[PDB]
């Protein structure tokens, strides 16, 4: 028994998108979730769901909804899925095995690319252990080798943990920036805060 | 908090070079990117180049390409920029500023600006 | 390189008078514009970092909006502390270009 539409507009159409390093997380509750506006429009190239189907989204109710957003390379969109492996999955953003939700990703080369630039977006390349599901790491400490302590980036394993994609138009489709939004759902019984536009 | 402190002013005859610096203070040097902006007397601001010391990448405008060099020194956290073959129209106030781009999802907009150095040819 | 035309070059207005400054890009930019405030003999201050996003600590008195080529920055009211020169900066592409600037006079 709610009437206010969910704030999907400020999540998908937002001009700014967070880095895969320190990705953003927006909570959605107490609203009507009409998903037709998402997949009906042209710019959203890819849209996949796990545990549910795109057509059934408008007919379901959800107890809690989270909208994670970030930017990754085109070839790395594959890594955004349950049980996957790779830099983004291992060190930046990992989904749970029982993930229930959908992943929306589309090309944003026109927005997020500059000729010899686009240092806005960074990703973690070194970490001692893989992240837990939905884990977040904002630290940037140097990755000391162990045979000698480190205070700054040095030789052998003493690397600076983060790196930047440096998107440019000259890159191919695979390396071009892709704007990604991940929706997570919970399907328990009442109370339920999010429901579709049903009667 | 972040603060940028620039060196003193400089006065030179034409054909010389300048070696101004801006020392980063507060936080850690692993989180700053520096850009240099020119402002001729009474005219608008002009962007020269960008330096990201951690990634070891620098960029310059087309006019200053091959004439301005920007460097940095981690040991002293001093961002260095040099201008070669000085000529009278190079006179301007030069500002050291920190980019927001080199961070999570921000852009090139300059957040913190240095006190600026007066450079004149005479 | 991408060039921006900023008009009017100078605008004079009284206390409490609304101010409107127009910045026009020669090529379409996807809202990647920022506005700065420069007091005489002082470094520019970043007022608006995105097409409409105000920086922390900047009074809501200031505002801005626009997309594509045409952008506008406005002051809801002229306080004495608002008399300054404002520049529009485009950062869609690497060769950052500042606008011609708009000198504000009481």
What does this molecule look like?
Chain A: Residues 118-126 are annotated as: Immunodominant HLA epitope recognized by the CD8+. The complex is a heterotrimer of chains A (199), B (122) and C (106). With 199 residues, chain A is mostly beta strands. Chain A folds into 2 domains: 1-116 and 169-199, no CATH class; 117-168, no CATH class. Chain A contains 4 helices and 10 strands; from the N terminus they run H-E-E-H-E-E-E-H-E-H-E-E-E-E. In chain A, the strands form 3 sheets. Chain A has a 5-stranded antiparallel beta sheet. Chain B is globular and about 40 Å long. Chain B is mainly β and 122 residues long. Chain C starts with a strand and ends with a strand. The relative contact order of chain C is 0.34. Helix content of chain C is 0%, strand content 51%. In chain C, strand 4 and strand 5 form a beta hairpin. Chain C has strands spanning 4-7, 10-12, 19-29, 33-38, 45-48, 62-75, 85-90, 97-98, 102-105. Chains B and C meet through strand 5 and strand 10 of B and strand 4 and strand 8 of C.
What is the global morphology of chain C? globular
CATH class of chain B: Mainly Beta
Compute the CA-based radius of gyration of chain B.
Answer: 14 Å
Q: Note the gap between the termini of chain C.
A: 35 Å
Largest sheet of chain B: 7 strands, mixed
General form of chain B: globular
The pair of chains with the biggest contact is:
B-C, 19 and 23 residues
Specify the oligomeric state: heterotrimer
Q: For the record, what is the CATH homologous superfamily label of chain B?
A: Immunoglobulins
**Largest beta sheet of chain C, briefly?**
6 strands, mixed
Count of runs of 4 or more consecutive helical residues of chain C: 0
PDB class: viral protein
Keywords: SARS-CoV-2, Omicron, Fab, viral protein
Assembly: trimeric
Entry title: The interface of JMB2002 Fab binds to SARS-CoV-2 Omicron Variant S
